[PDB]
Write a protein that binds this ligand. Structure first.
Ligand SMILES: [Cl-]
Length: 158
């Protein structure tokens, strides 16, 4: 099964951080990376000196159950972020979100697939379109049409 995962990070030197994350994703059991997007850059809000977010999308082939994949992405966030040395909501973070899972539609308290807000997040859709231009969502929406009709903030490569 092909799952699409979004990586975002504003920690220390984000290049190294996401590379670390990519590594962790490949080391997930019964899983290997198919494709990774270019790295993109989302600036923070306000004029304040604050680090940019690095964004990417990954295509993961897995034979794990979706909840099982979430166990692992949750684990990697904790092992690799700052939640222990700081806060959950930390000024800086490592985010791994399961955007899509096969053509599956999952509606539960701990897991909602497709990711609830991804169609409104250009830092998720543009990297995804780079690696899967022909993608169709379970409800029939075509990724290419959403990008022609919805308004997204400019998004340059890192
Ligand atoms: Cl959908």
């Amino acid at each position: 099964t092909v799952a699409y995962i979004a990586i975002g990070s504003n920690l220390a030197s984000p290049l190294e951080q996401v590379n670390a994350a990519l590594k962790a994703l490949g080391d997930i059991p019964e899983s290997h990376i198919l494709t990774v997007s270019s790295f993109y850059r989302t600036p923070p809000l306000g004029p304040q000196d604050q680090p940019d977010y690095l964004n990417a999308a990954v295509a993961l082939e897995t034979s794990l159950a979706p909840e099982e994949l979430l166990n692992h992405t949750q684990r990697i966030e904790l092992q690799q972020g700052a939640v222990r040395k700081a806060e959950r909501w930390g000024p800086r973070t490592l985010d791994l979100d399961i955007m899509l899972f096969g053509n599956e539609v999952i509606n539960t308290e701990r897991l909602t697939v497709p990711h609830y807000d991804m169609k409104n997040r250009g830092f998720m859709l543009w990297p995804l379109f780079e690696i899967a231009p022909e993608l169709v969502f379970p409800d029939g929406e075509m990724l290419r049409q959403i990008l022609h009709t919805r308004a997204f903030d400019k998004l340059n490569k890192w």
